[PDB]
Design an enzyme around this catalytic site. Structure first.
Site, PDB file in Angstrom:
ATOM      1  N   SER A   1       0.996  -0.121   2.661  1.00  0.00           N
ATOM      2  CA  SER A   1       1.140  -0.762   1.363  1.00  0.00           C
ATOM      3  C   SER A   1       2.046  -1.967   1.550  1.00  0.00           C
ATOM      4  O   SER A   1       3.248  -1.815   1.781  1.00  0.00           O
ATOM      5  CB  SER A   1       1.716   0.194   0.336  1.00  0.00           C
ATOM      6  OG  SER A   1       2.074  -0.503  -0.833  1.00  0.00           O
ATOM      7  N   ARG A   2       1.469  -3.158   1.446  1.00  0.00           N
ATOM      8  CA  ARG A   2       2.199  -4.375   1.753  1.00  0.00           C
ATOM      9  C   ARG A   2       3.237  -4.726   0.703  1.00  0.00           C
ATOM     10  O   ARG A   2       4.123  -5.541   0.983  1.00  0.00           O
ATOM     11  CB  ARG A   2       1.225  -5.526   1.907  1.00  0.00           C
ATOM     12  CG  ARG A   2       0.142  -5.251   2.902  1.00  0.00           C
ATOM     13  CD  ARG A   2      -0.701  -6.460   3.135  1.00  0.00           C
ATOM     14  NE  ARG A   2      -1.938  -6.130   3.825  1.00  0.00           N
ATOM     15  CZ  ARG A   2      -2.867  -7.010   4.172  1.00  0.00           C
ATOM     16  NH1 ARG A   2      -2.694  -8.298   3.937  1.00  0.00           N
ATOM     17  NH2 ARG A   2      -4.012  -6.594   4.676  1.00  0.00           N
TER      18      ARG A   2
END
Ligand SMILES: Nc1ncnc2c1ncn2[C@@H]1O[C@H](COP(=O)(O)OP(=O)(O)OP(=O)(O)O)[C@@H](O)[C@H]1O
Ligand SMILES: [Mg+2]
Lengths: 530, 48, 50, 170, 105
Positions: free
Chosen positions: A355-356
């Protein structure tokens, strides 16, 4: 009373979903990307969108509905407007078509194709979205406005994550104010009608339908409607986005939308590209995914999350559509057929997932536990492979990792209080003396039951599990705060001691085959109810 | 002795104790509510 | 139309969703056989027990 | 309001919040206060602590979340999610009035253990709780301890000594 | 006629003259249909019946008289403490049993 219909011509040719319209009169004008109404019958009316306007006056058209009814001699009229759908709070609770037709069971018009917000209208995300699953909420955090991809093989658990994410919101939304609620939209493309009916019945069972809406474009439904459905779901969500509300949006699945667009293009003899696709499928998904954003306070500070779904083939992320979507999305959730068949469900591969952005949205109480479990699993992935059955080891790393992987085996959405404490125990080693197979029971007995209250160990003052409103203090102060930490440690310690003494010893003492089967039944039930 | 007086009062006015208005809105059919009332009376008699 | 549907419910040709029973209270709140409806008002347990 | 507030982008936002607070105070169902904030952020009048405290007062004093009832409505979860919004999302920090409304809700609801949690949070944050509330909290705790209502009944029930999916309530 | 030339006035061009042609349709036996300046208006018995039927039929479908039980909203239980004092163990069992019995009966 005064209403009139504008005729632009007659049909000349039809090929499946695509069609050609010949003008009735010269010096008549049709605007581009406008819906057209074909005179199917005295009362029935079709709907169809333009894609090109030729020098000869001939018009290419994509038939969205009632293709079996369209014929050559039929009239064609112009609405003179873009393709629009009704949107609002009233549309919620109603399964519908992309155009807006309600599909039965047992005023404000929004545009289907609208430009996404500019960089100034957007905002980095700050609030989280709870999928109800520990792997996601802990290690792969999902913010509101963060569009994260789900990748997986056929029958791997892709749709179930989105359904559980939709269902987890009901318990909270009834409590908190309506502004901080998470409404939901579920776009099914290419899916079977039976699956959509099962989804509707499930959402009605858990009373999640009042906050959820469904768009249906089945495999039997035409191709233009399937191509159009996710744009319509985004249109339903954009009203709540621009109106300051939050909303979730799901696409099951974009891999089938691309096949529908491939049909539309190849039936029009457009120049193909890689893997048979025209080449504009990237733009097709980017128009849709860029609309999912966290808006600026100038625009209401709303949100539109997107959890798209994509079908890999033999666990191959190097496909065209997969990379095209990963090149758009703000993350990735990789489910693996190997772990799914190996009993781990959800089958999230933490190494291939990320999850950036969700670290900014993750709650601090979850942030610390996620950092700890991230270190633990980065160690576990190495310690598991480096040995290759050379010689086993008894270390807290591998122990806690196996215990936590059993905790990740989860059938439905979990509450935040139910999610943290179970992982806190493993990260802090309280769940080390128990056995593998008796982890789920431990968790169940920790959360749904309360051994200290049962056996009189009431030394703790407030920290218990029967209330569940303590979650909003854990969400604000964090367990590592001075007040919740000691009571938490005492509760978990007492639970571990009473478990190991009064329950686990009796389990190991059992030797009868029928008793072992009864126990395995209880453990399979604990694997579900948790 | 207080507790005995409370049992006598509870038997004299079993219906007063319950919220009748809430339950009556809620139940479409009166028969359902009646069955609930019967069970509560039997439980109190067993308690004393 | 609705009157015909009510007559069909009393006839038993058409039934209610989730196997709901037909009663005068039930029917009133929706909107020889008729004598059986007026009987249906009275509690079944009361009639059988007494 | 000579002080000027700005967004993350550097754009100017308006502090003129009074009319929205007046709309909040006139409300009688505490979801309309959230709707006021939704109409307020759209006008680029981002909420202040006075507004959130008005919302908390409205949640406490109101009878219901809406005209019609709701399954699972809690005044406390609203009065704490809004504080999570205040601290985490918006950066504003609550004051003694905010926590005081929360503790009033907990005292009215009868929840006493969570009231001790609120007391300890106030004390760790340098806030002085009103003794009239903590005394009523301890009184409710004594009431629940006397009648055995300190915990629910289903917890103190003896567990099945035999393992069975039906006996464990699953 | 009045509707005809009024529609001709609403049209962008009105400098040009207006001609009228009359035809017969077997399929539809009531009303007329008029076309002016590539604008068609349907005023026929089949079409009119379908519109009126749509209003009545859609209302009828929305009502859904068949199979329509009515259930009111449920508020918080708010059970009195004195009840619970007299019989704490069983009253719990009765509260769980009530909902099941309501669904079965
Ligand atoms: N965590 C889980 N635990 C137990 N069963 C699960 C879990 N996740 C999914 N399943 C089961 O796997 C099956 C398919 O799940 P799901 O519907 O998510 O697959 P899918 O990815 O949508 O498949 P397809 O891509 O073919 O539509 C169902 O029987 C479902 O109950
Ligand atoms: Mg699926």
């Amino acid at each position: 009373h005064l209403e009139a219909k504008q005729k632009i011509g007659f049909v000349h040719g039809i090929d499946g979903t695509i069609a050609t319209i010949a003008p009735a009169a010269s010096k008549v004008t049709v605007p581009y990307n406008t819906v057209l109404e074909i005179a199917v019958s005295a009362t029935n009316i079709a709907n169809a969108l333009v894609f090109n306007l030729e020098k000869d006056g001939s018009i290419g058209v994509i038939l969205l509905d009632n293709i079996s009814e369209v014929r050559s001699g039929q009239d064609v009229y112009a609405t003179g407007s873009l393709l629009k759908i009704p949107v609002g709070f009233h549309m919620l609770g109603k399964i519908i078509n992309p155009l807006g037709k309600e599909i039965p069971t047992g005023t404000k018009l929004g545009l289907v194709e609208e430009m996404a917000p500019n960089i100034v209208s957007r905002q980095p995300v700050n609030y989280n979205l709870l999928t109800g699953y520990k792997v996601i909420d802990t290690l792969i955090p999902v913010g509101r406005g963060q569009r994260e991809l789900i990748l997986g093989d056929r029958q791997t658990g892709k749709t179930s994550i989105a359904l559980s994410t939709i269902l987890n919101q009901t318990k909270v939304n009834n409590e908190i104010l309506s502004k901080n609620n998470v409404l939901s939209v579920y776009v099914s493309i290419g899916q079977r009608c039976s699956n959509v009916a099962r989804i509707h019945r499930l959402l009605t069972e858990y009373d999640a339908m009042k906050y959820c809406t469904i768009v249906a474009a089945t495999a039997a439904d035409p191709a233009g409607l399937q191509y159009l459905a996710p744009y319509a779901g985004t249109t339903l969500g954009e009203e709540f986005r621009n109106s300051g509300r939050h909303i979730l949006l799901v696409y099951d699945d974009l891999s089938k939308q691309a096949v529908s667009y491939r049909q539309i293009s190849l039936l029009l003899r457009r120049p193909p590209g890689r893997e048979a696709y025209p080449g504009d499928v990237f733009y097709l998904h980017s128009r849709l995914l860029e609309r999912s954003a966290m808006m600026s306070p100038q625009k209401g500070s709303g949100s539109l999350t997107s959890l798209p779904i994509v079908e890999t083939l033999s666990n191959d992320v190097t496909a065209y559509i997969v990379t095209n979507v990963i090149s758009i999305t703000d993350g990735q959730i990789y489910l693996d057929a190997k772990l799914f068949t190996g009993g781990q469900r959800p089958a999230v591969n933490i190494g291939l997932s990320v999850s950036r952005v969700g670290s900014s949205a993750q709650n601090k109480a979850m942030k610390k536990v996620g950092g700890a479990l991230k270190m633990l699993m980065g160690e576990y992935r190495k310690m598991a492979g480096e040995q290759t059955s050379g010689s086993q080891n008894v270390s807290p790393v591998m122990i806690r990792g196996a215990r936590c992987l059993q905790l990740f085996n989860q059938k439905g959405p979990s509450y935040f209080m139910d999610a943290i404490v179970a992982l806190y125990a493993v990260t802090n080693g309280y769940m080390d003396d128990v056995k593998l197979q008796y982890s789920k029971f431990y968790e169940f007995l920790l959360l749904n039951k309360d051994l200290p209250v049962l056996y009189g160990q009431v030394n703790n003052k407030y920290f218990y599990m029967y209330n569940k409103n303590l979650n909003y203090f854990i969400r604000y102060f964090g367990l590592n705060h001075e007040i919740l930490e000691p009571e938490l440690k005492k509760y978990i310690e007492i639970h571990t001691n009473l478990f190991l003494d009064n329950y686990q010893s009796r389990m190991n003492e059992l030797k009868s085959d029928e008793d072992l089967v009864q126990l395995k039944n209880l453990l399979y039930a604990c694997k579900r109810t948790v | 002795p207080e507790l005995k007086v409370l049992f006598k009062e509870a038997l004299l006015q079993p219906a007063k104790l319950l919220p009748l208005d809430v339950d009556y809105q809620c139940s479409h059919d009166r028969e359902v509510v009646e069955a609930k009332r019967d069970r509560y009376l039997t439980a109190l008699v067993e308690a004393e | 139309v609705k009157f015909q549907t009510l007559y069909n419910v009393l006839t038993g040709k058409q039934h209610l969703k989730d196997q709901v029973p037909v009663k005068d209270c039930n029917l009133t709140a929706i909107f020889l056989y008729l004598k059986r409806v007026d009987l249906t008002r009275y509690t079944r347990e009361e009639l059988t027990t007494y | 309001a000579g002080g000027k507030r700005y967004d993350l982008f550097g754009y100017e936002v308006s502090v003129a919040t009074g009319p929205f607070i007046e709309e909040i105070k006139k409300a009688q169902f505490y979801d309309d206060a959230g709707e006021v904030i939704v109409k307020m952020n759209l006008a680029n009048t981002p909420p202040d602590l006075q507004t959130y405290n008005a919302v908390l007062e409205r949640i406490l004093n109101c009878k219901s979340k809406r005209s019609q009832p709701v399954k699972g409505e809690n005044k406390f979860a609203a009065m704490m999610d809004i504080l999570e919004e205040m601290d985490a999302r918006s950066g504003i920090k609550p004051n003694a009035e905010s926590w005081g409304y929360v503790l009033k809700e907990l005292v009215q609801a009868g929840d006493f253990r969570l009231g001790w949690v609120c007391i300890a949070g106030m004390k760790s944050l340098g806030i002085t709780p009103d003794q009239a509330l903590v005394d009523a909290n301890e009184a409710n705790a004594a009431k629940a301890k006397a009648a055995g209502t300190d915990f629910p009944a289903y917890l103190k029930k003896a567990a099945p000594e035999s393992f069975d999916t039906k006996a464990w309530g699953i | 006629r009045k509707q005809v030339e009024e529609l001709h006035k609403e049209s962008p061009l009105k400098d040009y003259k207006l001609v009228l042609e009359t035809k017969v349709d077997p399929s539809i036996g009531g009303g007329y249909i008029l076309e002016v300046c590539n604008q068609v208006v349907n005023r026929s018995a089949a079409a009119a019946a379908a519109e009126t039927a749509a209003l009545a039929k859609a209302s009828a479908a929305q009502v859904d008289w068949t199979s329509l039980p009515a259930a009111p909203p449920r508020p918080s239980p708010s059970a009195p403490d004195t009840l619970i004092r007299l019989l704490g163990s069983v009253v719990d069992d009765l509260a769980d049993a009530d909902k099941v019995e309501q669904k079965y009966g």
